[PDB]
Amino acid sequence: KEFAVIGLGRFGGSICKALSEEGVEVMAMDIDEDKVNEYAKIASHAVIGDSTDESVLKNLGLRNFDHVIVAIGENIQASILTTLILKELGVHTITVKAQNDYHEKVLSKIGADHIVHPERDMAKRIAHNIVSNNVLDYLELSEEHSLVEIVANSRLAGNTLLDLDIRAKYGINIVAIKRGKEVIVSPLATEVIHQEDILIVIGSVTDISRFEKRVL
Amino acid sequence: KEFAVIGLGRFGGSICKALSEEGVEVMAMDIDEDKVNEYAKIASHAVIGDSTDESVLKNLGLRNFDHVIVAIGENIQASILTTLILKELGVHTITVKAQNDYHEKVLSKIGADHIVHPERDMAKRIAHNIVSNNVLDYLELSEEHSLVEIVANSRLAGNTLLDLDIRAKYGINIVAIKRGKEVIVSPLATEVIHQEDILIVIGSVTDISRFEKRVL
Ligand SMILES: Nc1ncnc2c1ncn2[C@@H]1O[C@H](COP(=O)(O)OP(=O)(O)OP(=O)(O)O)[C@@H](O)[C@H]1O
Ligand SMILES: Nc1ncnc2c1ncn2[C@@H]1O[C@H](COP(=O)(O)OP(=O)(O)OP(=O)(O)O)[C@@H](O)[C@H]1O
Ligand SMILES: [Ca+2]
Ligand SMILES: [Ca+2]
Ligand SMILES: [Ca+2]
């Protein structure tokens, strides 16, 4: 498989490092020579170039590449134009970092396959933690369902899962518990909740909200 | 509770918007007046100022604030100095966006409570997906354990969980299945895996790796 990353900022450079650490080859490109130099021994092919020169991406051989990541940030126009060119070159999968909603909307119509929002998505998790302290983190599983990490409080602590009856009363499922350094997976109803346990829970976002209100 | 965000880039501004959307008050600060203007109706108090002026943060009343987020990016020195000042002001919880390892190392010793890497953390998830296609995403639960989203292949499809015997053979647990738009939570052993099911799995990173090798 052939991988390329265009734009070596914190996202693009981290993609380059992660791919390198996974043990695969990656072409890493940036218009800034100093950035390219930083990745000269990390990427298998580090390239100084402007990705908005059509012949440049073609001459580099990006036609039919398996996956190209566009991580140009503040230059929304360069990002969009680069994406356009990659699509015309038949790149199978194009992932692009979006700067805003406008950027995303355009990227979607010109055929980016995956549009990602690293800063925004982490900000949302952090803000949710901030405003509800017992909720440590969450991961959306579908439009309706999420996984949520919940710190047990005094009300939960000391009771068996059987007695808590959370599935029947709240519609949500405790699928694991982090207890100290250990993770208890698929705990039985006989499991007793300890103070400072982190409950790993799956349910609808609606049911989770009701649980937070009732219990947290 | 009192919240402040310092630096309104994509991360800081997204934190400001997310907090605003959660319905809480937030003070949003930036040295760039145009950025502050963008958040004047989103933040409950939008402030033009240099967070590295000690008297500025004190006069704004940040002493003993519940949570302050430092999202100054490229100015590592301003970030570090701002963090130092907030700590001296007794801020209960300081979360800081780190630009690199050096930045993180210094932030840790001068007492940032939470150091976050939005670009890097998303890059790692993406790169892992890229190099192992059946693996859609993952979330670390502990140093030893992770949650992983795995697309079922032809080998898994058509078999009951009972017959697959994945817990006994691989040490990992299927705690949910995304099937179309639905999530099946805590499936029973009688559940049959469908093509294109997304298995939500929890196990040790070691056991997960062995499973990927054997089955994916
Ligand atoms: N036309 C182009 N061709 C190749 N690289 C480019 C082009 N335009 C910009 N870049 C590179 O893209 C990289 C990332 O751009 P920038 O730093 O503005 O994005 P960012 O959103 O701050 O990135 P991150 O959030 O990942 O740090 C920069 O190193 C820049 O040199
Ligand atoms: N001393 C300071 N006081 C207040 N705000 C500052 C200070 N220095 C920088 N900022 C603001 O911090 C914001 C973010 O900085 P910058 O854009 O360099 O970070 P970034 O890593 O690109 O952010 P993001 O990744 O969140 O887009 C900018 O709006 C900038 O004006
Ligand atoms: Ca444009
Ligand atoms: Ca960024
Ligand atoms: Ca420094």
Swiss-Prot record, chains A, B:
Domain of life per record: Bacteria
GO MF assignments: monoatomic cation transmembrane transporter activity
Record keywords, A-Z: Cell membrane, Ion transport, Membrane, NAD, Potassium, Potassium transport, Transport
GO cellular component: plasma membrane
Phenotype of null mutants: Impaired potassium uptake.
Annotated NAD(+) binding sites: R10, D30, I31, D32, D50, S51, I72, G73, E74, K97, A98, Q99, H103, E119
InterPro entries (alphabetical): NAD(P)-bd_dom_sf, RCK_C, RCK_C_sf, RCK_N, Trk_Ktr_HKT_K-transport
Membrane topology per record: Peripheral membrane protein
Domain named RCK C-terminal: residues: 133-216
Pfam families in the record: TrkA_C, TrkA_N
Function: Catalytic subunit of the KtrCD potassium uptake transporter. The 2 major potassium transporter complexes KtrAB and KtrCD confer resistance to both suddenly imposed and prolonged osmotic stress.
Protein name as catalogued: Ktr system potassium uptake protein C
Source organism per UniProt: Bacillus subtilis (strain 168)
Gene that produces this protein: ktrC
